[PDB]
Amino acid sequence: PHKSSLPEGIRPGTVLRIRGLVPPNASRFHVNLLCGEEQGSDAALHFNPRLDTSEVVFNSKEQGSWGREERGPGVPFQRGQPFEVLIIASDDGFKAVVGDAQYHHFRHRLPLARVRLVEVGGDVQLDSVRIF
C-alpha cells in the first residue's frame, strides 16, 4: 500500500500523475483520495480498475459506507501492459484521464478541502506517483 501524505491538503489545479503497469494476473487495483491517516478514513474518491470483472468503478466512502457507484466506458487497461493515469482536481469534481483520452468526470461528494492522503493499492506495479 503506497501512501503519499498531504497533511496540508490539495486545491483545484492539483494533478496526480500515476505511472505503472498492470501485472499479468491482476484482479483489480485502486487509487484512493482519503481524508485522513487513520484506518477507515473517508474516501473523497475511489478509482478502481477491475481486470477480473472488466470494468472501472468510481465511488466515495463516508463513515464506513460506500456510496453509489459510477462506471466509466469500458476498460482502458490490460494485464501485462503499462499505463498512465491523471487524476485532476477542479472546483466541481475529479477528472480521470487514461492514456491519450479523458475517461470520466466524478463530481465532488465530499469537500475537496478534506483530502489529506493519496493511497494506491491492489494488483498494480507502481513506477511513479507525482503530484503537480
From Swiss-Prot:
InterPro entries: ConA-like_dom_sf, Galectin-like, Galectin_CRD. Induction: By p53/TP53. The keyword Disulfide bond does not apply. Keywords: Apoptosis, Cytoplasm, Lectin, Nucleus, Secreted. Monomer. GO terms for cellular component: cytoplasm; extracellular exosome; extracellular space; nucleus. Pfam families: Gal-bind_lectin. It is found in: Cytoplasm; Nucleus; Secreted. A beta-D-galactoside binds at residues 66-72. Residues 2-132 form the Galectin domain. Mainly expressed in stratified squamous epithelium. One of its GO terms (molecular function) is carbohydrate binding. Its main location: cytoplasm. One of its GO terms (biological process) is apoptotic process. This is Galectin-7. It comes from Homo sapiens. The gene is LGALS7. Could be involved in cell-cell and/or cell-matrix interactions necessary for normal growth control. Pro-apoptotic protein that functions intracellularly upstream of JNK activation and cytochrome c release.
